[PDB]
Amino acid sequence: SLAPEDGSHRPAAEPTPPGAQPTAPGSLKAPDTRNEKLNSLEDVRKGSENYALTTNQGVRIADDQNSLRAGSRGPTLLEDFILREKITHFDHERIPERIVHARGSAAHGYFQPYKSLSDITKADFLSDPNKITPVFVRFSTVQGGAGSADTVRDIRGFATKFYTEEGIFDLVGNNTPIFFIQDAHKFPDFVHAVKPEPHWAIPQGQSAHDTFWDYVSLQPETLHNVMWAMSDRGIPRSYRTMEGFGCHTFRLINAEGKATFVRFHWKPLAGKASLVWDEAQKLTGRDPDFHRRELWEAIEAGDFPEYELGFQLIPEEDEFKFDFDLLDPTKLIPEELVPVQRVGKMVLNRNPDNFFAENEQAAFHPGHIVPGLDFTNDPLLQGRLFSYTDTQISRLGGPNFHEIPINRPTAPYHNFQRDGMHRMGIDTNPANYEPNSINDNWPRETPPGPKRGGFESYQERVEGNKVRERSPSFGEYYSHPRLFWLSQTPFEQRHIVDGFSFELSKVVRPYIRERVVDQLAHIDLTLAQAVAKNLGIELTDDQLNITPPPDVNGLKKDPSLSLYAIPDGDVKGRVVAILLNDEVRSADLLAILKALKAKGVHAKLLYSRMGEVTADDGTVLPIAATFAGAPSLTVDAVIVPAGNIADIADNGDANYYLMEAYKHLKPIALAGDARKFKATIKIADQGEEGIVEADSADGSFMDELLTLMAAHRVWSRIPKIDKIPA
Amino acid sequence: SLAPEDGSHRPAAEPTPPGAQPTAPGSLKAPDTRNEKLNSLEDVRKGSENYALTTNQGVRIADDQNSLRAGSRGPTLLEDFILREKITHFDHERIPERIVHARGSAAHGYFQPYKSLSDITKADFLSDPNKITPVFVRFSTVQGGAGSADTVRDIRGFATKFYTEEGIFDLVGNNTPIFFIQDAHKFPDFVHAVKPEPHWAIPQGQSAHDTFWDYVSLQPETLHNVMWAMSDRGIPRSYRTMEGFGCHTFRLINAEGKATFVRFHWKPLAGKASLVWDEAQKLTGRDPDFHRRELWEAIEAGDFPEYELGFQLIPEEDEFKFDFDLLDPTKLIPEELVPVQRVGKMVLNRNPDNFFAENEQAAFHPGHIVPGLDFTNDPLLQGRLFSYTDTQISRLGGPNFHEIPINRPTAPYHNFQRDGMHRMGIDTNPANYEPNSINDNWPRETPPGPKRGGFESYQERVEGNKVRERSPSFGEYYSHPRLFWLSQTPFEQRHIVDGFSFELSKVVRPYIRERVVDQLAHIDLTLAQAVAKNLGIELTDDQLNITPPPDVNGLKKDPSLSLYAIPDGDVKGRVVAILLNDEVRSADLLAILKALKAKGVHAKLLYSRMGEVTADDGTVLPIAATFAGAPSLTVDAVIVPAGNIADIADNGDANYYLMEAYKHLKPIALAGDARKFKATIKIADQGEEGIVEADSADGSFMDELLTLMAAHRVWSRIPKIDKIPA
Amino acid sequence: SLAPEDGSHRPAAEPTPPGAQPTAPGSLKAPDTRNEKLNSLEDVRKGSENYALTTNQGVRIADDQNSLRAGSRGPTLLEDFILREKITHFDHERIPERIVHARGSAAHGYFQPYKSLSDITKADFLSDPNKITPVFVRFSTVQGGAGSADTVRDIRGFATKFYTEEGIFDLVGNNTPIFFIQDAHKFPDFVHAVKPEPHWAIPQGQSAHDTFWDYVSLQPETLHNVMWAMSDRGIPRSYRTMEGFGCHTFRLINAEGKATFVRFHWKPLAGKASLVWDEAQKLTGRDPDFHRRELWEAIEAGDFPEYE
Amino acid sequence: ISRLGGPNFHEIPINRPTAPYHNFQRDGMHRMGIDTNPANYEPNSINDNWPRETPPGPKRGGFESYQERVEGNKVRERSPSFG
Amino acid sequence: EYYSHPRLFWLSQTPFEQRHIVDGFSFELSKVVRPYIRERVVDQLAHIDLTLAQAVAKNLGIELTDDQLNITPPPDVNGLKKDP
Numbered sequence A, B: 001s002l003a004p005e006d007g008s009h010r011p012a013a014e015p016t017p018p019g020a021q022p023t024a025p026g027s028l029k030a031p032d033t034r035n036e037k038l039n040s041l042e043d044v045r046k047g048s049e050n051y052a053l054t055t056n057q058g059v060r061i062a063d064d065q066n067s068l069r070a071g072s073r074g075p076t077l078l079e080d081f082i083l084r085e086k087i088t089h090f091d092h093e094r095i096p097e098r099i100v101h102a103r104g105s106a107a108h109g110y111f112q113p114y115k116s117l118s119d120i121t122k123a124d125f126l127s128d129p130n131k132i133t134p135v136f137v138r139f140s141t142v143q144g145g146a147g148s149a150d151t152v153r154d155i156r157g158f159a160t161k162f163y164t165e166e167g168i169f170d171l172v173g174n175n176t177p178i179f180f181i182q183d184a185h186k187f188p189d190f191v192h193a194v195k196p197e198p199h200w201a202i203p204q205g206q207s208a209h210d211t212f213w214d215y216v217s218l219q220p221e222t223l224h225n226v227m228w229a230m231s232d233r234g235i236p237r238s239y240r241t242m243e244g245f246g247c248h249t250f251r252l253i254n255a256e257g258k259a260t261f262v263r264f265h266w267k268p269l270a271g272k273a274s275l276v277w278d279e280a281q282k283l284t285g286r287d288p289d290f291h292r293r294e295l296w297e298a299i300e301a302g303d304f305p306e307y308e309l310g311f312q313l314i315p316e317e318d319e320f321k322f323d324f325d326l327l328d329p330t331k332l333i334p335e336e337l338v339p340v341q342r343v344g345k346m347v348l349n350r351n352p353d354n355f356f357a358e359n360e361q362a363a364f365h366p367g368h369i370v371p372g373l374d375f376t377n378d379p380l381l382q383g384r385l386f387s388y389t390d391t392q393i394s395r396l397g398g399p400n401f402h403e404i405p406i407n408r409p410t411a412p413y414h415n416f417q418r419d420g421m422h423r424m425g426i427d428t429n430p431a432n433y434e435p436n437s438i439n440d441n442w443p444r445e446t447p448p449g450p451k452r453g454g455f456e457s458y459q460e461r462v463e464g465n466k467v468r469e470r471s472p473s474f475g476e477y478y479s480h481p482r483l484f485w486l487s488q489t490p491f492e493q494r495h496i497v498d499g500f501s502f503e504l505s506k507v508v509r510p511y512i513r514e515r516v517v518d519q520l521a522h523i524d525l526t527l528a529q530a531v532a533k534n535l536g537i538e539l540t541d542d543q544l545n546i547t548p549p550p551d552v553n554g555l556k557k558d559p560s561l562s563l564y565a566i567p568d569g570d571v572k573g574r575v576v577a578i579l580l581n582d583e584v585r586s587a588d589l590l591a592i593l594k595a596l597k598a599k600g601v602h603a604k605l606l607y608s609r610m611g612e613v614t615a616d617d618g619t620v621l622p623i624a625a626t627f628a629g630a631p632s633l634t635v636d637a638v639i640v641p642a643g644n645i646a647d648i649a650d651n652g653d654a655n656y657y658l659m660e661a662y663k664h665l666k667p668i669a670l671a672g673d674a675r676k677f678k679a680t681i682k683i684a685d686q687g688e689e690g691i692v693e694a695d696s697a698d699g700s701f702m703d704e705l706l707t708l709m710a711a712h713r714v715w716s717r718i719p720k721i722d723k724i725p726a
Numbered sequence C: 001s002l003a004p005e006d007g008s009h010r011p012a013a014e015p016t017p018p019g020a021q022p023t024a025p026g027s028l029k030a031p032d033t034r035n036e037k038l039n040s041l042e043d044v045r046k047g048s049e050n051y052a053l054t055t056n057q058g059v060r061i062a063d064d065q066n067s068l069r070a071g072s073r074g075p076t077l078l079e080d081f082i083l084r085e086k087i088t089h090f091d092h093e094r095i096p097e098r099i100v101h102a103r104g105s106a107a108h109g110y111f112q113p114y115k116s117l118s119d120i121t122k123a124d125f126l127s128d129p130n131k132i133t134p135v136f137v138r139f140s141t142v143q144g145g146a147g148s149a150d151t152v153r154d155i156r157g158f159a160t161k162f163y164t165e166e167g168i169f170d171l172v173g174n175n176t177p178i179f180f181i182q183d184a185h186k187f188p189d190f191v192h193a194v195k196p197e198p199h200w201a202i203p204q205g206q207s208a209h210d211t212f213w214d215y216v217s218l219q220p221e222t223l224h225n226v227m228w229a230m231s232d233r234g235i236p237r238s239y240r241t242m243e244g245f246g247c248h249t250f251r252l253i254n255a256e257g258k259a260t261f262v263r264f265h266w267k268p269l270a271g272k273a274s275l276v277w278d279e280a281q282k283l284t285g286r287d288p289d290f291h292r293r294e295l296w297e298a299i300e301a302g303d304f305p306e307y308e
Numbered sequence D: 001i002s003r004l005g006g007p008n009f010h011e012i013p014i015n016r017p018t019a020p021y022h023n024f025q026r027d028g029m030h031r032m033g034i035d036t037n038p039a040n041y042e043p044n045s046i047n048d049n050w051p052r053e054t055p056p057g058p059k060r061g062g063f064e065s066y067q068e069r070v071e072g073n074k075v076r077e078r079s080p081s082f083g
Numbered sequence E: 001e002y003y004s005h006p007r008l009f010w011l012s013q014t015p016f017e018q019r020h021i022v023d024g025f026s027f028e029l030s031k032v033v034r035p036y037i038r039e040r041v042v043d044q045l046a047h048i049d050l051t052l053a054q055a056v057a058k059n060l061g062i063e064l065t066d067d068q069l070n071i072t073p074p075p076d077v078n079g080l081k082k083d084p
């Protein structure tokens, strides 16, 4: 018996705040959280406690500490089959990572629609508000490998596998509403340009290098999604606080056979929130697993990630009523023109048990649709339908990947397909072909119909010649970038300018920076000039005179494109660092901790060492982490209680903690003599917006702090930080 | 509905004789045959009746007859995911075949000991006569591919997977008691020499080619197994009628830790029986699936393959008591010296449901042992231990091949191994390493002990230098070949001479033939002279004077080495062809079928066309096959009843049927006017032993026929066949 | 879509200091640098300038910007074999990364002995001071994936493939002279303990988590290599400024058959130097490719890594 | 991809074209060709866009599909003409 | 034998290298969530060198017991006090 006698090795099977208990496999942490897919996995779940250690063949092992050898100092013998089995399985643990979105974090949950959508789609999972659909969702970055960092600047993937009663539906989306390119034929060119360069394999997790901006400079279609990536969209606070989009126009098909064009949305119920660049970049160093960790811990805490599914719906007759082509994946449909209709809610409420088995082997593909959905001719979507099935043959070892437990449908599946590597299902059908008489033709085809019918494609008219040709309707590149730019707040525009400036400064060939700047001049002059000034480049008279692109269907902004223009802040699940001293004023800490708890905001108690400190009244305060061990990058705000401030007044790490949180625009609250730290961040005596200060933590001190946290960051502090040495 | 109104598409779920019903997956044929392993496969069996046809993702298909195209004569579209999934699975159906033994046929069964063996072994499956152990057995050839023919001249494999309560034990044996070579390092040389030659990949399923005989002539250690292969051992009648052997000395270990050397045997309860060469070779053309079909149909009929497990046991102090080395796998242990102790019975009573999923993916390996067993230093076995684990990484796609349903232990298996391609088991253990405190070190090691203990190697003393050196004690090559030769009947000797003669005639390079004949002269001059004569070679004076090798520990023969020396016939499950005419004497047929039924002998009714014919008394007799459709090759005996013989008397196929049966030494019985056929086989008016004749098919006529059948073939007929042109 | 007229897209094929020129494939940067192994790769090196763009089957492509469709706003057709080859190759680019040392950076070079060692070894690559043996070296971390960061706290790998006249010799060493564990049977237990934990796959490139310290606390044999890992040896400044060791006692065998026990060492001629922890950790975010980059740039500058 | 182990099956010697082949595809299991192109994508400026597309023409031209007229609905339907 | 070579290594380092070793152990063990694991590691450190063990313990808010303070240092390695 190696476990401690007090049982402290084992986390409580109840919801607990981040950091309070060690994290655990979902079925152990939350055994009573269930859904149909989770339950269906029980046949392959393997426990451990009270079982003997064995080989894979079920032979009990006596000594798992030694190889078999001729004498205890002699050579290892080939007959040691226990050693060889154990080392063989180790030697072959790895499988190929995903070609893109290799870095990803996943969870189980469930979806329910708010009302029946039968008037517009026969999809069974949207047919009844009491119909609950298990989901498994993977969030990801795009460029980096499976061992790259979370808080890079990149697009994020948001993939949801819906285990419906009529088959798997996979909605494979991203956190921006468009993509960089128009035709799937170019996807290897684009991806190769953004990925590490082929001679030396650098940089990881970063579009900030020559080949990416070379391609962008030569392919103006990319500029729209580049604007998004350069905005703080490219650096989300959390996968809980980013939007999701299905990228393409698809169709809904109702029982009467009517088709409706649809684009899919996920709205984060926790609000939209992003980091700032210096914070995000430093945090890839201090905690490259920060988003994986934050998701897992939110779910362990009961702060379940919740998203609302929404549809933008366009009638067939309105296909051509926009300035842009609905089938062009570099174009968004502004919500001002076509509102998002709320459809239902998804809650992610349980972590996996084994990350490899459930997360790494999950296969999502946007061709996995169900009756009541269909495709369109969007030429990016069209090529995706080839890729997501092909890629699995190497990644997951063959055509039986749907038998890997996380991938299995909960709906019945029967057909005449046989064999392949790793074949699990043992088919008893006398027949492996149809038509057959020897099994009375079973399993049988099913006509389409209003419910439980066979899949039939919508009979869209095709007419034209066999051509490799881009539609002329796709040939406009600048109006959508411009609409995005004009829709951002002035601080968001600033952060876009700084993203371009930073990225282009890492481009070693200067003519590529110049060429990018020229393209920015075709979008908006103010944007082009501000980036040029940061790169020491001067616009030509001609560039100064490029006329801006047209408005989009008369729009000069759409505030839904901004992260922050319309407040949607939610503090539940956020976290505050509390900087302890060796004699804290216990009444301040009582007021702080209870105020946070009441709003679902977590805390981490930090000091210059581990263990405990004792408050003025004798309360023993447990320390979560050191100032350097849990840097301000990992929190949303910082509070310093009164007490013996001289203990930490001269601690470089403590002061720097405040400087870093200050630079990154985070709310900071200072009680009593903690106000002596005002000198560190240079705060005027009479105070400034975004610094909460009082004689004590009572009264409105916590309310004012929580008000600041609801607005996420103190954007008004931006001119002040500009000169801070931090 | 495509099935016939009368239900005749579906075979009865009851035992039925060969050809009476269409054959069927075993769980449909024999739903109520159960054992722990068959039951445990229920989680993966999939049915079909009354289910809708779907993709693998569970989406119902409406039209499984057409691809999606732009117009009904247009191009196929990339968005046809139903077509691509279906064609993708098809395109990847095949997996690598086994390197050797690729051709094989398998069945489920059970094993039960006759008494407790705890005095000599702690193997749990041998501890009690009540212990029933499920088995899956695969019989195989060695050289040919998975699509090669069954009745080739070759060694056969006989592999048994015991699903014990203490682990999988695989006993991976062959149908001869030795192997061709001494040291595993030469396995690829030997196998490359026997396999099709590398320039042109010829011949399939045959050792009758230059490279095989080249290697043999250069490596006299091969000559013992070569004698077996060249004898009628090389062409068994049926997997039910051959012996099996574990090939190596292994050890039994008992609860006190005492070691006993053991060699394993399987004794076929249907007796020993083989084809003759002409019959076997022609049978590869008429039915290359003959042994696979015969096994499957024997089990369908209730003629379950039964074998008695036998041990030759040698005390540890007796290691050096023979004039050969116990660890030399080109040496057999004569049963006259160490008798076989009969230990239990295995019964094969159910066919698989899906050949690929159960047979093709099954993985046997002789290093799969359990506590109570152990290895020895046999240098062929030692190297096998490496190969059978390594080969599955490509064949079965990775290190989780034990999760392939047929391979799973029924015993518990738990350990800290993780990941690998197509990982099924989802581990919930917080720990993936030991020693660990976080799971209280579970799953835990188990000390060795008398039952349910961990595996510990027998502490054999090793003393010697690190050398690549063959033991001098292995350096004797001719005494065992000679013992084998001297133990054969005169007709078994003639067939061995004929086997060497035929093979060597196919070797193009005549010096290779000459060198092989030189080796034969070192074994037995009579053998050497007879082969030399058929090759047009004359023994030199030196060859004529080679002193024969010594006897084996005083033995100048051992009848246990002969297939036929000691009577061992069983007619149950054999088959007789009955040659019909268009007006059969019903009284003959009634008698024939009644006597055959009483002994469990099957019959096939043959004619010149299909349909039926009508007896003298109006009994309608359904025809099973034509004379050409079901050649005498496929039966054990031929009976021709009386009736309208003029109908068939000048039918060439009918006459030839009897000539071929006659040539291949099969019992023939002729009733009434059927004796007109005596002329086509040149039988004197007064009769001949092995031809049964009478006025009618009375009681005595059938006893005589069945007596011949018990002795398998009419060996006394051999000098008559030279003259028959068939 | 072409190169600038000034030729500034193309790096000079001469040694240049870090940052002065964009970096380039070795055979284009330094085409006059050769050795027997680098030459023998010529059979498979493929250029690009002045060649037509083709499928893998050698068919020239006219339009590499578009899929074949029925009308320019129509569905993509299954007969577009150009699209499907290109996408198929892309869809199958990745192979499994190394179970351990998946993150690593490599270069070509050569080795020669200072004097013949025939008194102690008959190895041909050590027999003559003028026999040059081509090498390929890969430096690595241990725990993290191929896309993890360089300046983590970890042991480093230092693997040299010598292409000798009597066969390949791989000296597969690390930057400390011992290992954590005594018997190979425990390797999967130790590696699983240091690797990201199996429920959530955290942390990448870090032994700072419960399972690693659990294992160490239960297996005191690990303490020696742990001391090395916790020292600044765990955070080298550059692959050029760390020591290498062969980890085990091997044997040398001379022509007379005499065995001598040997342990292998590499001494960095650029000296020993390591970062400090706060700097190493921050550098994993500011430049996760710092060691890869530095090694490439030193070779391009002529600061060739040398080791004794 | 399963039979010959991945997407570099054209590098197996019997499958190799004798014609030139150059493109921006990379990696894959069993990769033989060692690409020296600074670019693995097009369009690119850093290798002056080589290897380059070739217009169709009478000889040594790029492949262009014949511009067959396509007209009808997306159907899973056998032509009556085949019946 | 598990402690003499770690001790030899420790005694061979300069005072600033020793500090960095203390800081590495302290930083790492501060990220170990289960406190008894940190305690057990500090007990192993007390078998190597008490000064090391105390300096780590202090950073982790751990106090060495009397028994731990009394652990006999492992033997020198073949007479060596250090190897630079």
Ligand code: HDE
Residues within 6 Å of the ligand: A098, A099, A100, A101, A104, A138, A139, A140, A156, A157, A158, A159, A172, A173, A174, A179, A183, A184, A185, A187, A245, A246, A247, A248, A362, A363, A364, A380, A381, A383, A384, A387, A388, A391, A392, C091
């Ligand atoms: C709209 C959201 C979106 C878009 C436009 C694309 N990706 Fe994705 N992708 C693969 C191929 C592929 C192609 C051919 C295109 C445009 C033609 C896109 N992508 C753009 C893939 C290589 O087949 C992929 C890699 C592994 C895999 O199974 O599929 C793939 C990944 C991917 C993910 C990750 C899903 C997951 O496994 O967690 C997501 C969210 C996207 N793509 C979104 C996406």
Ligand code: HDE
Residues within 6 Å of the ligand: B098, B099, B100, B101, B104, B138, B139, B140, B156, B157, B158, B159, B172, B173, B174, B178, B179, B183, B184, B185, B187, B245, B246, B247, B248, B329, B362, B363, B364, B380, B381, B383, B384, B387, B388, B389, B391
């Ligand atoms: C004596 C019974 C016996 C003997 C002595 C050998 N084979 Fe077999 N064989 C494999 C390799 C192998 C080696 C290395 C040696 C001597 C060193 C033998 N054989 C002699 C193998 C390549 O690992 C093999 C190929 C597929 C596989 O899984 O293992 C293999 C097959 C095999 C079978 C087939 C079992 C089955 O799949 O049905 C049998 C019955 C034998 N060997 C018997 C055997």
Ligand SMILES: [S]
Residues within 6 Å of the ligand: A177, A178, A179, A246, A247, A248, A329
């Ligand atoms: S998209």
Ligand SMILES: [S]
Residues within 6 Å of the ligand: B177, B178, B179, B246, B247, B248, B329
């Ligand atoms: S054997």
Ligand SMILES: [S]
Residues within 6 Å of the ligand: C177, C178, C179, C246, C247, C248
């Ligand atoms: S080592």
